[PDB]
Amino acid sequence: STGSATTTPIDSLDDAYITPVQIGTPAQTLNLDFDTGSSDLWVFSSETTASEVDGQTIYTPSKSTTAKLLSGATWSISYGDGSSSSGDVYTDTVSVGGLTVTGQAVESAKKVSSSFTEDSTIDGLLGLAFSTLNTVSPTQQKTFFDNAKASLDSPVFTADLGYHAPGTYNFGFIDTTAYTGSITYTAVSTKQGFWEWTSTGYAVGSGTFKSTSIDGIADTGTTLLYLPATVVSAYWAQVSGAKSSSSVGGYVFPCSATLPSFTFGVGSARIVIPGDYIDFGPISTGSSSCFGGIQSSAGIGINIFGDVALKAAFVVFNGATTPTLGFASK
Ligand SMILES: O=c1[nH]c2ccc(NCc3ccccn3)cc2[nH]1
């Protein structure tokens, strides 16, 4: 089997991407944030504290004839931006772009943190990291991808995120029309539960390529590109007026600037992030200070190839017995 679903930026900055997901019988369609950096499928629901729901579409398990309470199971998760959610668990039928999994753990939110409440466009998350990170207790649950894998034509999914435009998540097949040139595959470590890999280096604009190993994760749930301070300093040094601001929380630059591209290495191959991808707009409405899309990972503890990097590529998440990642230009 296969599935294919369009993913759409939630705003004009591509802060995140939402993908429609059918849950239950009859289908309840929720727009979920497909997150290759986590492993929980959780949704706003009929059980979510009323004051914490503001415009989201909710899953109501009592209206689904295939919903079954997973007795005793609870979940609780916190993300890198400090956001969090928690609740209990149902199993139900979940379909993504025509691909159906029965008995999928659907984690029903009883509580969500303010940043989820304040974002009316995200109805929940669909985790696509490794199931070892799933937070359901006392019985850990599998991701949608893990559950679907045996049924897929090929044990893969692909992320094709758009810049200021819709993109695509495919499951079970590689669309050879969706990229240019060839796909370069690279090794993955699953030891931290992430799609963790090692970039072979970087270039800034038309500068020479610096060969250097950068270990990081392919994380569709993270907006920006977080890289070592040395790398990030070398990038922003090429932007007149750019500076790291403690008060804002990262590198900012004059909105009047033309940003240089950023290249990262995948084996001997190169993925080029156009300068415009690195612009995340005024730090506050009407400001002429703009927030940078490449930021330091110092104090995060890990480098993160977030949407800024991933949307420049066609990315294969290969879930074969030994997982790998593939990157192609597009
Ligand atoms: O690295 C990041 N990923 C993000 C996704 C959405 C956002 N913005 C909206 C949001 C935040 C938290 C919960 C719900 N919606 C910011 C992000 N930063």
Q: Residue 36: which CATH number?
A: 2.40.70.10
Distances, alpha carbon 221 to alpha carbons 139, 194, 224, in Å: 24, 12, 9
> Are both 225 and 246 inside the same structural domain?
yes
Please work out whether the CB of residue 16 comes within 6 Å of at least one atom of ligand 1: yes
> Are both 249 and 147 inside the same structural domain?
no
- Which residue lies with its CA nearest to atom 12 of ligand 1? 115
Answer yes or no: are the C-beta atoms of 305 and 312 closer than 8 Å: no
Rounded Cα gap, residues 190 and 132, in angstroms: 9
Which of 141, 174, 207 finishes a domain?
A: 174
Which of 124, 153, 174 finishes a domain?
A: 174
Structural domain including 104 reads: 5-174
> Are both 21 and 165 inside the same structural domain?
yes
Rounded Cα gap, residues 17 and 29, in angstroms: 16
Which strands make up the sheet holding 250-254, listed edge to edge? 243-245, 250-254, 289-292, 279-282
> Are both 13 and 158 inside the same structural domain?
yes
> Are both 160 and 193 inside the same structural domain?
no
Atom of ligand 1 nearest to the CA of 121: 15
Token digits for 128? 């696509």
Contacts for 172-179 with beta carbons within 8 Å, 24 or more apart? 172/1, 172/2, 172/3, 172/99, 172/148, 173/2, 174/316, 178/314, 178/330, 179/313, 179/314, 179/328, 179/329, 179/330
The strand pairing partners of 31, in sequence order, are 20
Which run of H or of E encompasses 317?
strand 314-318
The strand pairing partners of 170, in sequence order, are 4, 158
> Are both 29 and 80 inside the same structural domain?
yes
> Are both 155 and 13 inside the same structural domain?
yes
Burial of 183 (0-12, 13-18, 19+ CB in 10 A): buried
Which of 152, 174, 196 finishes a domain?
A: 174
Q: How many domains does the chain have?
A: 2
Token digits for 139? 């019985």
Answer yes or no: are the C-beta atoms of 329 and 179 closer than 8 Å: yes
> Are both 162 and 52 inside the same structural domain?
yes
Please work out whether the CB of residue 222 comes within 6 Å of at least one atom of ligand 1: yes
- Which residue lies with its CA nearest to atom 1 of ligand 1? 222
| Residue 80 CA, distance from chain mean position | 12
CA 59 to centroid of ligand 1, rounded, Å: 20
Q: Which of 8, 11, 14, 15 to mutate to test the pocket of ligand 1 (most atoms within 8 A of CB)?
A: 15
123 is catalytic: no
Q: Mark out the alpha helices in the chain (DSSP H runs).
A: 114-117, 144-148, 229-236, 307-310
Token digits for 220? 């569709």
Q: Which residues contact 72 (CB under 8 A, 6 or more apart)?
A: 138
| Experimentally determined by | X-ray
Answer yes or no: are the C-beta atoms of 93 and 2 closer than 8 Å: no
What single DSSP character describes residue 61?
Answer: G
| Residue whose pair of structure tokens reads 């192609």 in the numeric block | 328
Please work out whether the CB of residue 115 comes within 6 Å of at least one atom of ligand 1: yes
Please work out whether the CB of residue 308 comes within 6 Å of at least one atom of ligand 1: no
Q: Mark out the alpha helices in 51-171 (DSSP H runs).
A: 114-117, 144-148
3-class SS at 284? Answer: coil
Rounded Cα gap, residues 210 and 269, in angstroms: 13
Strand intervals (E) in 178-311:
184-187, 196-204, 210-218, 225-227, 243-245, 250-254, 262-266, 269-273, 279-282, 289-292, 294-296, 303-305
> Are both 77 and 136 inside the same structural domain?
yes
Token digits for 218? 């392919």
> Are both 276 and 170 inside the same structural domain?
no
> Are both 143 and 36 inside the same structural domain?
yes
Please work out whether the CB of residue 119 comes within 6 Å of at least one atom of ligand 1: yes
CA 15 to centroid of ligand 1, rounded, Å: 6
Q: What is the resolution of this structure in A?
A: 1.7
261 is catalytic: no
Nearest alpha-carbon partner for 128 in 214, 218, 58 = 218
Q: CA triplet 192, 198, 203: central angle to 5 degrees?
A: 140
Nearest alpha-carbon partner for 216 in 196, 234, 202, 189 = 196
